[PDB]
Nucleic acid binder design. Structure first.
Lengths: 109, 386, 63, 172
RNA sequence: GCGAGAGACCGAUAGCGAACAAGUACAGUGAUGGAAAGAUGAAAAGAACUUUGAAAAGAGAGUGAAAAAGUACGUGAAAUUG
RNA sequence: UGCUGUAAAGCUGGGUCGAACGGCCUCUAGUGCAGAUCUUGGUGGUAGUAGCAAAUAUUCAAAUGAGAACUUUGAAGACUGA
RNA sequence: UAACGAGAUUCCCACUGUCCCUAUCUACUAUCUAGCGAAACCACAGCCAAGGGAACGGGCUUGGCAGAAUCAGCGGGGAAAG
């Protein structure tokens, strides 16, 4: 088990945003992405890249894409008091299509 | 003053209180009366409501316009993997009612029934029935003593049997364990039958025949808190009524200066324990048959499962019971099938049923093919087929 | 760290509305000390304060 | 100042006070009763879990028409809450009294909340505006909080004597 | 009005509306209407200094005959509350 | 803490408190409260309850700060739409 | 009496959930949480039946009965409040 690790995931935001108030779909996709990263990195501390916020909101408040490719990297929190030893950083991955991609471990090189 | 116009009341007073069932498993309130002359046989079984389907059948009812004519009927499928006998209970007649005297368990219990005794199985030492299993130490004389007690004193013998839920598509791992009364023979015969069946499987074929009338015990579909208009079927108030219209306008007279129990109020709806009677067993299918849904007229190599499986259930890969009409409960519900409490000699009950055809189109949409081979024959090659 | 005054000043010096004034987020200490219109002019000339381009309203479809 | 309860041994006790705290009295009373008699370090862990919504404060007296929760089973109740403003003030006074005890030389591992109580403070008056041009009251109900940490013959008749003596003669 | 002396007068919800920056604050377009509000101690000697705290504060300490007198100040009732 | 008196009440033990007060013979009166939708002041239950819902809509980051849904700045998404 | 009428009335066509006979859906509430936090009302209180009674009792008499603490609704009663 390595604490510092980077992986690429696909999140099916379409099924997570089902039935959601139209004026909250992009706001809720922010919360869903934070909840998604905790499920995988085990960290309550999730930080979203501002370029990710641009990707979510690119089509207005309810035009969230059905799938987004995310690069989630677990980093060490040196700040004191941290009260959360690690934290997750989510930033977007540009791919021609978000279909048929599996979870892939990224080698920081 | 009297009502201006007479009308029947809304709803039945025989089904109060309209509260949630205490247990999700329906319990058999009454068992068929015991006849000593009959051979020793079970009286009930546990299955799972898979889903509803359609059949075609030639009606045999002289004097009816549909006599010797095809009728399209709704049917319900009950996935019934064989039950495992694990215990025996003796009941003694007392002036205060039946009283359980002695419970004797089998030496070995499967893990799925031992999970029944745990709220947090993954954090347990799983100590259930370990000392009891040790009580079988090379002589099992304590077990024989208890069985002799049951033979000597008990007047009603019931068997503790559980379902093999691992054979169903449900994600639940706890088995369902229930008491099933044994009928026929003397108490000694019943206890001998129960002992000879410990850890053995009993199938529906040995409990229910085809064309039988059986009863269904189940907890109905829940709807949560519901208003009087839908809970009781009362009349909606006019459109122009202040503060809303889905109400009962008068909930009582001035006297008695109380609200009567017979007045409709909002409350919990559905998820009630219900016994439904006189359901005809159209089919007793076998899990080993690869042509479950094939009949003598539609020889298609076809299982009971529709295309895409049963919606929100999965596939019925076990022995199953095909019943006429609808039964209480939802998909995945555990359903208790009971034998009839009386003898019905009406033509509707003694009828022999021969199925013409069983619908296996997809339940997930307007399905229009009974079989993927039929789909391909009708549509030809697709781009994904190359 | 309260650049409300500077943005109001920069709008008047540049001659556009406050919606078209860009204050460098990395130059907060520099902008915070720009208390006079003279100081705002220097920052405008150096590129610390930038007049954001007007949003385009093309007449191409009208034509 | 005079505290309501004086400690049995003043040398092994430390006290903290808070007056005119603008926190709900009813919420603070319940959170003070939830940790009364606890170990000091035990109560501090509990108060942090209440802020995280992992554990709740049982509302016992001022609980009319509040919600029901499963986190009240720990205390044998159905009505519990997670009052953040009240927990933060109490944690503040627990930290002050713990620092008060450390200056005395007491051991924080042995400290117990022997006495905690909440009293009413004078109200703060505001105004609310009602239909048909009426003014009502919009008061606050502040609290005084104080807490103290602590470390952990027969005479007989003539014939009663006579009966006693004669029975003793029987036993040699 | 000016200046005095008194009383079986009232004693701070009393006595003038006003024992106090009272015909004041405040209300009303206006004519007009019109309050509440006394008392640490002999003396501020009104809490230096240390410590916890972002601070308010607290705990020590100190002043004092008294802090069961700390300006939210003599005594400190009842409702009501811990 | 008790004692005395049928009672109205009187006296006393303990605690608190800090400057005046009682008995007896007479005099005198703005002299005895449970009520008056009493007056003024205060405090409850209700009750941590009703509720804090018109005006399309906010989100990410950085800074500041003890502390940031709400401050500032940037990026974005919006709206008013002469 | 032409024209005119947010005037009153009857009939006809069109139209329709007004209705037979309801059902489903959306937003904001209600619900739960953090913060904030009132008011009306209040003799005491709050289970029924019959009796008698200022002739329609929560209390009285005689019976039925009667088990902590409560949440969401509801509109029979409190001859509820105003």
């Amino acid at each position: 088990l390595q604490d510092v690790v980077t992986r690429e995931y696909t999140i099916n935001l379409h099924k997570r945003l089902h039935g959601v108030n139209f004026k909250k779909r992009a706001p809720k996709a922010v919360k869903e992405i934070k909840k998604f990263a905790t499920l995988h990195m085990g960290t309550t501390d999730v930080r979203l890249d501002p370029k990710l916020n641009i990707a979510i909101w690119k089509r207005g408040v309810q035009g969230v894409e059905n799938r987004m490719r995310l690069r989630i990297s677990r980093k060490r929190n040196d700040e004191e008091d941290a009260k959360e030893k690690l934290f997750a950083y989510v930033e977007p991955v540009i791919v021609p299509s978000t279909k048929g991609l599996q979870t892939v471990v990224v080698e920081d090189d | 003053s009297h009502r201006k116009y007479e009308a029947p009341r809304h709803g039945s007073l025989g089904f109060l209180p309209r509260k949630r069932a205490a247990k999700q498993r329906g319990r058999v309130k009454s068992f068929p009366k015991d006849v000593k002359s009959k051979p020793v046989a079970l009286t009930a079984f546990l299955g799972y409501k898979a889903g509803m389907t359609t059949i075609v059948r030639d009606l045999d009812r002289p004097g009816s316009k549909m006599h010797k004519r095809e009728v399209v009927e709704a049917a319900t499928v009950v996935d019934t993997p064989p039950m495992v006998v694990v215990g025996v209970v003796g009941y003694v007649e007392t002036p205060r009612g039946l009283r359980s005297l002695t419970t004797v368990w089998a030496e070995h219990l499967s893990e799925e029934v031992r999970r029944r005794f745990y709220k947090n199985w993954y954090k347990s030492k799983k100590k259930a029935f370990t000392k009891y299993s040790g009580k079988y130490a090379t002589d099992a004389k304590q077990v024989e003593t208890e069985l002799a007690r049951i033979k000597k004193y008990a007047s009603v013998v019931r068997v503790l049997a559980h379902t093999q839920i691992k054979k169903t598509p449900l994600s639940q791992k706890k088995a369902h364990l229930a008491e099933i009364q044994i009928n026929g023979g003397s108490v000694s015969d019943k206890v001998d039958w129960a002992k000879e069946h410990f850890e053995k499987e009993v199938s529906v074929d040995s409990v229910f025949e085809q064309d039988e009338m059986i009863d269904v015990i189940a907890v109905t579909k829940g709807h949560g808190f519901e208003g009087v208009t839908h809970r009781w079927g009362t009349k909606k108030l006019p459109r122009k009524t202040h503060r809303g219209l889905r109400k009962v306008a008068c909930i009582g007279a001035w006297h008695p200066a109380n609200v009567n129990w017979t007045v409709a109020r909002a409350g919990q709806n559905g998820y009630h324990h219900r016994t439904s009677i006189n359901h005809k067993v159209y089919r007793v299918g076998k899990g080993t048959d690869e042509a479950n849904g094939a009949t003598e007229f539609d020889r298609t190599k076809k299982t009971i499962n529709p295309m895409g499986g049963f919606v929100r259930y999965g596939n019925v890969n076990n022995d199953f019971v095909l019943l006429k009409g609808s039964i209480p409960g939802v998909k995945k519900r555990v359903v208790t099938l009971r034998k009839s409490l009386y003898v019905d000699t009406s033509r509707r009950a003694v009828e022999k049923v021969n199925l013409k055809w069983i619908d296996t189109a997809s339940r997930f949409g307007k399905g229009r093919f009974q079989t993927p081979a039929e789909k391909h024959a009708f549509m030809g090659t697709l781009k994904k087929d190359l | 760290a309260n650049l409300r005054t500077q943005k109001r000043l920069a709008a008047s010096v540049i001659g556009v509305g406050k919606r078209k004034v860009w204050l460098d987020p990395n130059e907060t200490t520099e902008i915070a000390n720009a208390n006079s219109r003279s100081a705002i002019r220097k920052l405008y000339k150096n590129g610390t304060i930038v007049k954001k381009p007007e949003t385009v309203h093309s007449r191409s479809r009208a034509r | 100042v005079r505290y309501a309860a004086t400690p049995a041994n003043p040398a092994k006790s430390a006290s903290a006070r808070g007056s005119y705290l603008r926190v709900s009295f009813k919420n603070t009373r319940e959170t003070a009763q939830a940790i009364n008699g606890w170990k000091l370090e035990k109560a501090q862990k509990y108060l942090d879990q209440v802020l995280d919504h992992q554990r709740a404060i049982p509302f016992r007296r001022y609980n009319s028409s509040i919600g029901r929760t499963g986190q009240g089973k720990e205390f044998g109740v159905t009505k519990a809450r997670w009052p953040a403003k009240s927990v933060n003030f109490v944690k503040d006074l627990l930290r002050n009294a713990q620092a008060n005890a450390e200056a005395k030389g007491l051991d924080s591992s042995k400290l117990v909340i022997s006495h905690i109580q909440v009293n009413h403070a004078p109200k703060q008056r505001r105004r609310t505006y009602r239909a048909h041009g009426r003014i009502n009251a919009y008061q606050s109900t502040p609290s005084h909080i104080e807490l103290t940490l602590t470390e952990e013959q027969i005479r007989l008749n003539s014939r009663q004597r006579g009966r006693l003596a004669s029975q003793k003669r029987l036993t040699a």
